[PDB]
Scaffold this motif. Structure first.
Motif, mmCIF file in Angstrom:
data_model
loop_
_atom_site.group_PDB
_atom_site.id
_atom_site.type_symbol
_atom_site.label_atom_id
_atom_site.label_comp_id
_atom_site.label_asym_id
_atom_site.label_seq_id
_atom_site.Cartn_x
_atom_site.Cartn_y
_atom_site.Cartn_z
ATOM 1 N N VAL D 29 51.310 -6.797 9.793
ATOM 2 C CA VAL D 29 50.673 -7.308 8.738
ATOM 3 C C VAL D 29 49.226 -6.897 8.938
ATOM 4 O O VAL D 29 48.318 -7.574 8.276
ATOM 5 N N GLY D 30 48.699 -5.897 9.691
ATOM 6 C CA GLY D 30 47.433 -5.426 9.760
ATOM 7 C C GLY D 30 46.508 -6.441 10.228
ATOM 8 O O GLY D 30 46.544 -6.990 11.390
ATOM 9 N N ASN D 32 45.544 -9.281 7.650
ATOM 10 C CA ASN D 32 45.824 -10.105 6.605
ATOM 11 C C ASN D 32 46.479 -11.425 7.186
ATOM 12 O O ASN D 32 47.799 -11.754 6.986
ATOM 13 N N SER D 50 41.100 -12.876 7.119
ATOM 14 C CA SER D 50 40.999 -11.346 7.677
ATOM 15 C C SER D 50 40.977 -11.249 8.880
ATOM 16 O O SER D 50 40.499 -10.394 9.542
ATOM 17 N N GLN D 90 50.284 -15.288 7.577
ATOM 18 C CA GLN D 90 50.162 -14.172 6.947
ATOM 19 C C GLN D 90 49.941 -13.922 5.365
ATOM 20 O O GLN D 90 50.929 -14.700 4.854
ATOM 21 N N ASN D 92 49.781 -10.746 3.971
ATOM 22 C CA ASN D 92 49.996 -9.068 3.839
ATOM 23 C C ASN D 92 51.221 -8.820 3.023
ATOM 24 O O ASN D 92 51.125 -7.705 2.255
ATOM 25 N N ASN D 93 52.412 -9.655 3.090
ATOM 26 C CA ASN D 93 53.465 -9.528 2.151
ATOM 27 C C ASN D 93 54.095 -10.856 1.712
ATOM 28 O O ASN D 93 54.048 -11.760 2.444
#
Ligand SMILES: CCC(=O)N(c1ccccc1)C1CCN(CCNC(=O)CCCC(=O)NCC(=O)NCC(=O)NCC(=O)NCC(=O)O)CC1
Ligand SMILES: CCC(=O)N(c1ccccc1)C1CCN(CCNC(=O)CCCC(=O)NCC(=O)NCC(=O)NCC(=O)NCC(=O)O)CC1
Lengths: 214, 212, 214, 211
Positions: D29-30, D32, D50, D90, D92-93
């Motif tokens: 998820v980097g 995010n 972040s 998360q 990110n998705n």
């Protein structure tokens, strides 16, 4: 054809860990939720959890939150349920199951179930004994002193099914024992060979015992 | 956690008639209820989903009904093949929870048991042990009493009894009784008797053999 | 100031539908995504969906696709969430929330949360009973008995008395809630000065100020 | 969907110390990732976005680290007011998924409960019921036993207990025990007693009243 393959039995010492596998084939592994169910000896069904192999999304039962861990391996199309810090309560049969709706019908597919036995005793293969003695004759097969569960019994590699009674295993002094009787026409035995086929997967044992008239 | 309470542990009918099992949910689950059939020694088999819809391969004799908290599974034209334990389940709330299970029973006429006795095999005698096996097959009702006699003296220890579930063909019951002795004890006596007391006869059924 | 106003509680019959409102003020309604979060009693948070009030663009979570329906009324700067065919699984607290980044700082704003209780029982206002004693410190109490549904707010002296207070979670018995609240004050404070237990039950429009009289 | 697993359900520490809660993502998820704090009876408060940036007003004691799958929230100089549940999320998705949550627990020295008993009020007696209330406040650890006696005989039916979460000022626990009877039953007897047994108890704490 859709298949869910589970090992027959796993003997795990108290406090150790075991990982039950569920190898899927015949369908797209990543398309259907993979359910797991626990059934203690002589008890009801209990839901453990489900995992979707596409992204390993899981839904756990709070009772097995820290106990059971579900994973998948997509390179082998195999699902895994890991149990940690085993106790006598965790000795049960563990099924994996999926439900497929193809847009026409809804089918269910179940593994055979893995008999996880938590015990400090070692594996013991069974001692198979022939039970040999009008219009009909009854024969038998004594499957004595084995550990752990289970064992499977067939007659003449499954060709002899009618007239068979296979009695449930009874634990007695740390060992299991069961028996099986078969009643055949008096012209079948002893004229033809009658074979009791015993399998004990926990010890990699397969014994074929002929019912010899003697 | 939602509780699914099946009112009966056992349900009884005759071959050809119909049974019904009820399931009570602690809280509302709408119609997200399933029913399962589990025969002895087999994995469960899903019969009903959405309370009333059948899985593929399930005959129309299995009918589910109900909505909210009261659900019912009805089996018409009940046959000996239908002998199993039947479970309800809710998949409306997590965690998913099952019912305790109701075992189907079948009423039938009485049947006297067929009794067969077997001396220890020569194979087992080499191991130092000696087991005498008595088969009591195809009787009804399930209640039966088996005694072992050694030269007239009753032995109520070292006996391993096992009962089958109700037979999937004729709805009868079967019993296996095994008396285990050491090879020395076995050779110290001659007459070995398996005595069966059943409702079908005021006199016990007696199968014996003399080692002589 | 930026505010999100949700009603306190909503009592709904099993199978019926309710529309939880979230009135926004102090900012431009159509400039920020409106998020919705469900929290069941005792359990954690799960994301339902988000809607942009500018064009009603939505992002739903699959679990609530047919269950939750998000709308907005731009003439009143109010966001709505429609829940259909309510079961016990939908009995929870539902939050509306936004996140504002102004080019300098990032701030989150949450509504108080609407407690949705899906049940067939009826609203019942609480019975507020005083607990007065018959040392340098003295402990007073307040019994808030037999109300439904959740929640009730309990304060002491309209919030002026906040130290030494213990408000105990409500326990459910026969579809009626009951809690208690204790407060410890100096002996020079009571009974020389008034100590009042303020109980509010918005589900029944009940506000009861019960003084602790010796 | 992506699973955000918080391995520890609880995290024990003492005031002034530093605690760290971990959160592992099933997929990359980097950065995010967000962290939230929820105190009892309150709406969630966003702490970190972040993976490492604080929301406005969040003290610098809350720091977040991690990129990809492993993330960690660290609370330095832990306060008694920091008692809450901490979630990782998360974004990110889609769909957005929250962690199961981690409850902060504070360690402290033992403390005996202050026990106060209260007879049924005259207002409740005009209703037909009767509730006897016993408060057990500011004790530690949380395990405690209460036994109700009516004229010296133990009473178990009609007793409802309730425990508070750890106090946000001294990290102690409190419990209320209420014995509810009918007015007729409450007047059939005279002596009412609640007995508190605790780890600090060398003998039970007995508080009684005589009708
Ligand atoms: C513990 C087991 C369990 O819980 N399960 C189960 C899993 C595998 C095998 C058997 C049962 C449930 C899984 C989810 N399903 C939901 C209902 N399925 C449908 O409705 C099909 C769609 C029909 C349509 O869309 N036309 C119920 C059984
Ligand atoms: C379910 C809740 C949820 O998911 N949310 C949330 C919503 C309301 C309130 C609190 C949280 C997410 C909303 C979006 N944010 C994105 C991270 N914000 C920034 O990066 C600032 C941009 C600065 C820049 O550089 N332009 C994550 C939390």
């Amino acid at each position: 054809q859709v298949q869910l393959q589970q090992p027959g039995a796993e003997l795990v010492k108290p406090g150790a860990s075991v990982k039950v596998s569920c190898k899927a084939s015949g369908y797209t592994f990543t398309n259907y939720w993979m359910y797991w169910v626990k059934q203690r000896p002589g008890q009801g069904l209990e839901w453990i959890g489900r995992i979707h192999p596409s992204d390993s999304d899981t839904n756990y039962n709070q009772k097995f939150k820290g106990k059971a861990t579900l994973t998948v391996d997509k390179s082998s199309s195999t699902a895994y349920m890991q149990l940690s810090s085993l106790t006598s309560e965790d000795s049960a049969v563990y099924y994996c199951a999926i439900e497929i709706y193809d847009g026409y019908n809804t089918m269910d597919y179940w593994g055979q179930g893995t008999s996880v036995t938590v015990s400090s005793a070692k594996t013991t293969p069974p001692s198979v004994y022939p039970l040999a003695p009008n219009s009909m004759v009854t024969l038998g097969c004594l499957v004595k002193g084995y550990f752990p569960e289970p064992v499977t019994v067939t007659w003449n590699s499954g060709s002899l099914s009618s007239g068979v009674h296979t009695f449930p295993a009874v634990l007695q002094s740390d060992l299991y024992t069961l028996s099986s009787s078969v009643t055949v026409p008096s012209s079948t035995w002893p004229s033809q060979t009658v074979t009791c086929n015993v399998a004990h997967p926990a010890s990699s044992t397969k014994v074929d015992k002929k019912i010899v008239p003697r | 956690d939602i509780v699914m309470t099946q009112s009966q542990k056992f349900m009884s009918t005759s071959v050809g008639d119909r049974v019904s099992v009820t399931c009570k949910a602690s809280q509302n689950v709408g119609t997200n209820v399933a029913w399962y059939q589990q025969k002895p020694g087999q994995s469960p088999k899903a019969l009903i989903y959405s309370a009333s819809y059948r899985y593929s391969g399930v005959p129309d004799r299995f009918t589910g009904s109900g909505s909210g908290t009261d659900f019912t599974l009805t089996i018409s034209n009940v046959q000996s093949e239908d002998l199993a334990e039947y479970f309800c389940q809710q998949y409306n709330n997590y965690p998913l929870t099952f019912g305790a299970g109701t075992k189907l029973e079948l009423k039938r006429a009485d049947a006297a048991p067929t009794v067969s006795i077997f001396p220890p095999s020569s194979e087992q005698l080499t191991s130092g042990g000696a087991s005498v096996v008595c088969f009591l097959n195809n009787f009804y009702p399930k209640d039966i009493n088996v005694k072992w006699k050694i030269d007239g003296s009753e032995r109520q220890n070292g006996v391993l009894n096992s009962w089958t579930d109700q037979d999937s063909k004729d709805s009868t019951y079967s019993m296996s009784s095994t008396l285990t002795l050491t090879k020395d004890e076995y050779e110290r006596h001659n007459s070995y008797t398996c005595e069966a007391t059943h409702k079908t006869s005021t006199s016990p059924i007696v199968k014996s053999f003399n080692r002589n």
